[PDB]
Every structure is written in structure tokens, then in C-alpha cells.
Amino acid sequence: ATVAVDNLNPKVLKCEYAVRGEIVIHAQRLQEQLKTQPGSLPFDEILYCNIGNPQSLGQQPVTFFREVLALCDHPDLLQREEIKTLFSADSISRAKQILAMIPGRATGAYSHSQGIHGLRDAIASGIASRDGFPANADDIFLTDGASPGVHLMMQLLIRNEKDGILVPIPQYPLYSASIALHGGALVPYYLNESTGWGLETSDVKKQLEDARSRGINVRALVVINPGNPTGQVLAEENQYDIVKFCKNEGLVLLADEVYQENIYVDNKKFHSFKKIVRSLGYGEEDLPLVSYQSVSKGYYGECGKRGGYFEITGFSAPVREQIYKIASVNLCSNITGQILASLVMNPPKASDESYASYKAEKDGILASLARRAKALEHAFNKLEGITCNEAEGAMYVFPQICLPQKAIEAAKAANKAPDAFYALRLLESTGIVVVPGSGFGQVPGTWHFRCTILPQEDKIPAVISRFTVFHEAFMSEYR
Amino acid sequence: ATVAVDNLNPKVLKCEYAVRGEIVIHAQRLQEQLKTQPGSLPFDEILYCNIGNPQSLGQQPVTFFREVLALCDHPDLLQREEIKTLFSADSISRAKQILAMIPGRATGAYSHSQGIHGLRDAIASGIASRDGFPANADDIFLTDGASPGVHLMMQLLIRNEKDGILVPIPQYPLYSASIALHGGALVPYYLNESTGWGLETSDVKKQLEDARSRGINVRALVVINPGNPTGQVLAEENQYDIVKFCKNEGLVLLADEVYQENIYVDNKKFHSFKKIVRSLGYGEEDLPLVSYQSVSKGYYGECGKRGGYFEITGFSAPVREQIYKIASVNLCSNITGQILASLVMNPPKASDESYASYKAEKDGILASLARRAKALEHAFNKLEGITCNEAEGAMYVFPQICLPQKAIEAAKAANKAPDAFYALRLLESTGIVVVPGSGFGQVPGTWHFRCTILPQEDKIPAVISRFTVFHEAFMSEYR
Ligand SMILES: Cc1ncc(COP(=O)(O)O)c(CN[C@@H]2CONC2=O)c1O
Numbered sequence A, B: 001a002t003v004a005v006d007n008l009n010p011k012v013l014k015c016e017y018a019v020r021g022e023i024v025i026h027a028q029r030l031q032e033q034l035k036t037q038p039g040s041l042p043f044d045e046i047l048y049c050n051i052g053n054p055q056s057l058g059q060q061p062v063t064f065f066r067e068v069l070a071l072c073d074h075p076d077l078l079q080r081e082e083i084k085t086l087f088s089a090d091s092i093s094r095a096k097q098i099l100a101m102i103p104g105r106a107t108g109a110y111s112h113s114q115g116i117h118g119l120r121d122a123i124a125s126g127i128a129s130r131d132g133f134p135a136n137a138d139d140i141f142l143t144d145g146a147s148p149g150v151h152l153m154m155q156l157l158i159r160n161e162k163d164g165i166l167v168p169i170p171q172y173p174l175y176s177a178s179i180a181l182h183g184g185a186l187v188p189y190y191l192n193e194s195t196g197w198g199l200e201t202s203d204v205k206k207q208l209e210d211a212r213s214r215g216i217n218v219r220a221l222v223v224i225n226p227g228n229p230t231g232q233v234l235a236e237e238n239q240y241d242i243v244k245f246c247k248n249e250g251l252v253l254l255a256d257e258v259y260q261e262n263i264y265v266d267n268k269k270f271h272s273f274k275k276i277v278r279s280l281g282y283g284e285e286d287l288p289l290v291s292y293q294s295v296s297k298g299y300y301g302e303c304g305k306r307g308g309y310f311e312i313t314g315f316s317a318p319v320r321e322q323i324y325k326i327a328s329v330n331l332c333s334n335i336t337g338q339i340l341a342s343l344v345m346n347p348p349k350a351s352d353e354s355y356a357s358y359k360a361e362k363d364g365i366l367a368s369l370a371r372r373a374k375a376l377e378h379a380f381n382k383l384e385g386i387t388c389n390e391a392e393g394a395m396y397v398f399p400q401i402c403l404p405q406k407a408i409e410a411a412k413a414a415n416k417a418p419d420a421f422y423a424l425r426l427l428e429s430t431g432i433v434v435v436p437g438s439g440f441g442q443v444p445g446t447w448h449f450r451c452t453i454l455p456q457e458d459k460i461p462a463v464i465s466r467f468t469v470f471h472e473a474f475m476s477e478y479r
């Protein structure tokens, strides 16, 4: 029989990934329409407001980072006196220190499947000057981004359709996609929109009991902190609760901390789950704890590079061997992403002026983002039926829309979720690509969308004008 | 509710990847020993002859490729004039026109999930040049090396414990591992050692019905050409029989051509299954075909970079909609991987100063390799109890060991496969790491081990003197 949709793996069919799905494919059809037919569209550019891809938009690559990477890439450059004029001194000094920790100066070879050892040591030292607690090179696994590390873990832990993971609703849908792909149950817990997207451990507990009664064995809890799509930053005190909760529930803690250097609210600061766990005084029975961090986000932003890592603690060898086994299949992650992870974790120290150029780009880039983060909040809040929460961190705003019934029905007719119907019509009127609430998951009855915070600071008012024009015409058909 | 090997995914436990298996693990352990206590070992270096990792050993990276990547890595460099002095005009042109197929000129941005469009265009042209049949940008998926593309077709086609895949024996363990990880059935078909590792489609037809009779539904056929570990190169005539056999039988054809540029026999050249398929005239549905190419291999690699791609043809959209979904998720392959992949298919072609440095450079390494393949084969044959076939292509030799029966017994008592007992014993005396046949799979009753062809030219004689003093000591102990 011919290979067809009817005879593919069910886990691939139930899998859905909205960030790069229906709306984006529609957007690319429209992209062609204005190479081919300039002027047939009511707008000029397509604005991808759908993906946290800072450099896609204006963001400038940090220079110290690119300098070292250009150097490690072509190491012969180091045997030439000119480079001294074009490259910073400590970038040349860092390149050389790095090449000296790869075994035969081979930047092109496969590394140990956990990552070059040096780079792992560097990262372990960055973790420890962030926590106040030591870290081990042996516990780190360098990955092609944070993504493969979530797959690795779903695959380790899900034996059955009956296996379950607690996931926030709404969630960055790599979790809901990864979990369908590995054929396991998704067990929602519900972030309180009214309480600033608050995570309450009694809600988790209740949801964990409902899933157990239903017969599902729940293996782990994912926490996204800072959150995506909701940008909440969890607080120290709430974090002790989650850790104590996993301990007596026999649950792996999956800590997604990719947005850690994206904290915009003056009031709160980032705290590692490792910092919390160590401090509570756990050394093993550590609950298993896996922490993810990536090079894609923050100020570096750096997604194409495909670099990141995760740290494990509180697993036995021979469970650790089994992890090593899954990772060793692809051999290793890409070296340039590995070097990059090390750099993000040891940036310049003030010891050198390149440090001064660095501090300027890092700041400014982060001021830009939160200046940007607030403007979109205020803009959206002024709109009929739209309410936009504070964004403590990350790079996303996630407004609620109070879609009228005439609009819910027109969506039922079009065979679309009300969210997606809105997101699609927006796109047709304005070229603005956003991701609909659905398959981020949301409280049934409520409706949202996720915009990026990353359009160019100067392009923003023009963007919220195109938008409001559409929204208010949409409201006038459908209220 | 503790986490333990008793309760992990049985798909993970069954899976086995020897290329970095138990032997690699003992070796790593022993490497640390040489640092901890310098005179304890009976040897003083640890030689990984277990993994096709050219640059790990002596091999120099290709200069043009590295020039173009650094510029792409650090683009402001294009701006200053010093570079004309350091970089060749050749590269500068190229880094520049590459930087212009990238959407925002943005090099740390996620791409489209297939990879940068322009790059797919370059690769499509390289393929046309190679076969003289046309090929589209659309049918290409840039991946972090060849490997994730193999996981991707397994994930797509395996529904079930009864779904199955025809795989050559011996086979590079990514295949047996990836079939175990997606919980399907490996259907072995044996290559025939004495006929140059010949593959007869009459014998594959036998394996196929036997499988269909055990109630397994065989969805695909993997051909590795050139082979690994067995290094053979297929004849055109044989390949044609395979294509027709596939069409007639209903199989997907998964062609792993990662070693296209590793051919050391003037007798036969390399013919891609794209060509073999077009040459029988067939565009869509002619048959489903997936073919892999990678950056890591050949004269160039380069394994650390993790670049590669697959070319699908003969699948319907919406099945292509589904491939796309799986890949979207991880978002993209690293950008320097993608760039490199275009450089490898469109290298310099007779016009720049760069060309000659480049072919001198290109030629030196193939030749070194070929020189190396002839040495090792001759070395292992001379050895009593060991036979060794020509290696027509790729990076390795696959010698049969004729183990005495007292040696089988010793291995049972140590609870290892016999060739593993050998591989370990060998490691513990000489420091040489090699992968044992059970490990790639082999005809029952026979025994083998894979050595790489890749240690620098000078080190071989010394390496095979230790090997031989060990070997013949082992053979008279077990007399
Ligand atoms: C919470 C979270 N975890 C993990 C990842 C994976 O990142 P990398 O694999 O690139 O390291 C992302 C990426 N952010 C998604 C991807 O694109 N835009 C987003 O919202 C994320 O937001």
C-alpha cells in the first residue's frame, strides 16, 4: 500500500506544533503573493510576530561572541600579526584558550557525546557563580539547543500511553508536541490569569490526583520559568513549594529556564531550581532534577547556532548510563553551539575593555526589550475586549480577547478554533503573524494569542496601528 | 515511583549503540588513569580506532570552507580592507553572496525548518550537476548531520512493533538503534563477505517474505552505499535491480550516501540512487525515496559541525506536510552546518587561486586515505586467524577473526560476546580501541571487529606492532 497519511505513525498525526503551523504556512503563501503581485495586498511586509527569533528582527549579534567564533573557525588567522588590529585582544586570548582544550585542536571532530570536557567545566563554574553552590562537569550535557534535551527526557521516562507529565496550561508547545511524539499522556495544570499567571501547588495537587484516578502514572512536572507564553517569573517562596511538592510526590522536576536572563520587573529576580534544591539541602533524592538553559534567548540571541545544555542531579548510575546511551546516538552536539554555551556562561569579567563594549550591548538590548515589553502591553490593553497581563520576563505578550458569539460561530462554520480564526483574519488584513491561544492550551472558554516583543522599537507604533484598524473592524462585524 | 532502570522506557533499554558502547566507556575510564597515575598502564597513549572522526586524528580542515565560515560567522569583517591580505578573494565573494540569501542578513536566526532557501538552492544545483537530472529546493531538508534525518523517517514509518525495515548486516548501529528507539522491527539481510560484501536482491526477497510470514509489515529498505563497516561500492547494474525490486515490492528506499566522496577503487565510480531512479524515468510516486548526505565524511569532514540533509522524492503532499511537522519542532539545523553543506556540493570550480590549493588539498587526503586502506588490509591478513577484504570505500576495515574455542568459553565465563572479549583484552594491553562485530551484527558463527582507516600515516606501523604482539599472545594462550 502507498505511504499515505492514513498509514503513518499515529504519534506523528496527533502531534501538533502551532508556532510553525497553520498560520505560518498561510503566511508563506502570502509572502509569495507580494513577490509575485506587488500591491494586491493591503500591506507591504509580512511581520513574523510568531517566533522568539530576536535577530530575525533588529537585534545585533554581540561582537565578542562572534569574534571568538570566527577565530575558532579559522584558527590559522592566529598566526598573523594583522588580526591584532581587527580583533579584540581578549577575544584572541579566549579563542586560544578554547582551542587548547579541544584534544588535537580539532574544532571539526566529534566531541565526547556530553560535550567537550573543558566547555563543560566552564559551564559548571558559571552555574556555581550564580547559585553559591558547586556544579559538576559530569552532570552537564551539551545539546543542539535546549530542544533535544526535552525529547531525550520524554523518551527516557514515557513507557506508555498511560505515562504522564504535568504541564502548565498555557505552555510553549514543544512539550505538548514532544509528549504526543513519544506517545505519553499530557496532564494539565492551570496558571491563574487573574493572579498574574500564578502557579498554585494545590491546583497541581488536585490535577495530579485527577490524573491518577483516571489511571495515569505521572512521572514528572515541567516548570517553565520565566514562563512562555506567559512571562511570569516564579518567586523564591513559591519555588520551595514546588520542590517540596515533587519530593513527596516522587516526581522528576523538569526545569525549563531558557528565559533566565530576560527579567524586566524591577521587583523580582531569577532563581535556579538548582539554587533552590541545594539550599533546601538535598544531595540525592534530589528528586530527579533536570535544568535546561539555551543560547537562543536573553541578550545573545543566537537561535541559529543551536547551542545549550541541561544539568542532571538525583539520578543513579545506571540511569545515568542510559541517558548517556540516548545522547551518544547522534554523537554530539555542534561544536560552535558548545563554545557559545561556554561563553554565555562565562562572559567578559570587567577584566577587559572588550567587557566594556559587551556591557553596553547587553544593557540597552535588555532595556530595549522591556521598554518594548511595556509598550505592547499598553497598546493591547486599550483595545475593545482585549486585556493584556504584565510581562515579567521572556519575550512575549499573551493577550486575552473576549471574542463575541457571532465570531465564535463564523469560526465553527469555517471549521476553525475561534483563536485561529482571529489569527488568520488578522494576517489577511495586516501581514502580522501571531500564534493563536489554541495548542498553547488555555482554560476552556478563554481566548488568546502570542505576540513577540521583538519588532524594532521604531516599527512598533506603525504595527499597532495596522492592528487596531483590523481589530476594530473585526469587532464591528462581530459584536 | 523512584526512577530506575526497572521502570524506564523499554525502547531505550533494548537499544544498543556500540560505536560508543561498553568498550568506549572502559577506554574513557582508562584515559583518566594515565593522567592520575602515569606509569600504571602497559601502554602510554589511548588510540580511538573506533569512530570515523578524521580530524580527531591528524587531518587538516579544508581552508576555503573555513575562510567562508569565519566571514559568515563574523560579517562586519567584510567591511575592512585588511582581509584581502588574510582571506582569498575567492572566499570573500562567496561569504558575501551567501550572506545575501539569508533573510535579514541574520546569521544567528532560526531558518525556515528545511534550512535557508538559498542554501537548498545551491544544494539542488550540486545534485543536478552530480547526476544530470534536475532537483528541487523543496525536496531538501537540512539537518544537523545525516543522523536526525534517519530518526525522522523511523518516527514517520513505524507505528508498531510489527512495522519493519530491511537493514543490511553488518550495519552502522544508528539503524539498529533507531529502530529499537522507535519500537519497530529490524529485518536483517546479510551481505556476503566472500563475494565482496555482495548484495543479491534474490536473497533480500527471501528475507522479505520470511518477515511478511512472521506477520511483520516491511515498510522500507536501507541501503548504505558505500557501506559501513564493510566499505563496498555498489555496481550500477546491481543498483538498478534494487530500485525495481523496491518499486515492485512497495518499499520506501532509504539511501545512506554519506560516503559518496570516499571511493578508492578506479574500477567503479559512485552513482546516486537519485540518478539510478531518474534513469529509469520516474518523477512522483515513481517510488518513495529518501537519500542522505553528510558533511562529516569525505575529504572534508568536519563531523563536529553537524551538517547534512536529505532529499525526498516520490512522496505525496500531505505526507510531506507531516515530515515538515516533525522537523519544525526542533526548529532548524544549525546555520553553519547549513552553510557548510552548500560549500561541499558547490566547491570551487576551476576558477580561483583557491581552486588549486583546494584540490591539491583535495587530493592529498583521499590519497592518504586510500594509501591507508591498502596498508591496514595487508597488515590484518598477514596475521594468522585474520582475513580482511578490500575496502573499496569509506573509512574502515572489517576483519574476520577466527577465534579458538577456548576463547569462546572464556567470553561466556566473562559474559561477553566473543569478539567483545577480544576487543577489551586488546584495549587493556595496547590501548587500541576498536568496535566488535556483534555491535554491527554479523552472520551467526562468524566474528569481526571494525578498525578505522584514520590514524595518521606515521602511527600505523607502531600501532600494528603492538596489535600483532598482543594478537599472537592471545592466540597461543587460547590454543
Ligand atoms: C520555554 C522554551 N523551552 C525551550 C525552547 C527551545 O529553544 P532552543 O531549542 O532554540 O534552545 C524554547 C524556544 N522558544 C520557542 C522557539 O521559537 N520561539 C519560541 O517561542 C522555549 O521558549
Ligand SMILES: Cc1ncc(COP(=O)(O)O)c(CN[C@@H]2CONC2=O)c1O
Pocket (backbone or CB within 6 Å): B019, B050, B051, B052, B053, B144, B145, B146, B147, B148, B172, B174, B224, B227, B228, B256, B258, B293, B294, B295, B296, B303, B307, B308
Ligand atoms: C553510514 C552512516 N550514516 C550516517 C551517519 C551519521 O553521520 P552524521 O555524522 O552526518 O550524523 C554516519 C556517521 N558515522 C559514524 C561516526 O563514527 N563512526 C561511524 O561510523 C555513518 O557512518
